[PDB]
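Dear Dr. K.,

Following up on our conversation at the group meeting, I've run the structure prediction for Nuclear autoantigen Sp-100 from Homo sapiens. I'm pasting the input sequence below exactly as I used it, so you can double-check it against your construct before we proceed with anything downstream. Let me know if the numbering doesn't match what you have in your notebook.
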Amino acid sequence: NSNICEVCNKWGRLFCCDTCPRSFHEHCHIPSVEANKNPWSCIFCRIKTIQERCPESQSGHQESEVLMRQMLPEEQLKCEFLLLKVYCDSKSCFFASEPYYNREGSQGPQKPMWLNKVKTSLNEQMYTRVEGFVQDMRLIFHNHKEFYREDKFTRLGIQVQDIFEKNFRNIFAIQETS
Ligand SMILES: [Zn+2]
Ligand SMILES: [Zn+2]
Ligand SMILES: [Zn+2]
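The predicted structure tokens came back this morning:
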């Protein structure tokens, strides 16, 4: 197995996947690495299994259909993995914890949002459809773009949203378009 966490790229107290060479810190994995379970399979492995069991699950889908899906176990897993893919990018640090807003010429958002809040919400089964999770994820970046206006820091929101959107299209097999 790897000697660094797959998400944050640091060494430490790592839990190793039994079916692939990835490793994870306990709370870097989503869901948090399970207490017992030998063997243990990471989220990357669990998602690959879904695909392998239903190869047709990779044919293209419409986003509008994906968003209306209820959060049954497989859709819950897919949202967890998509959230983890965002945390995998180091620029996710900017969006992880609760933000505050005090900048001359801007007003904070009406509904603040952050990655750790989405993480808790998934853990607590607060989303009933995929739409709930995707709306909160996109709100993170939209709030950032609006607040930072013409400061070049706005680009961080664009960058991390692009990771999100690429991974959303991949994980939920969104039909490719120009
Ligand atoms: Zn880590
Ligand atoms: Zn694995
Ligand atoms: Zn099948």
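Two things stood out to me. Helices lie at 43-53, 63-67, 73-87, 93-96, 115-123, 130-148, 154-171. Strands lie at 14-16, 23-25.

Best regards,
J.T.
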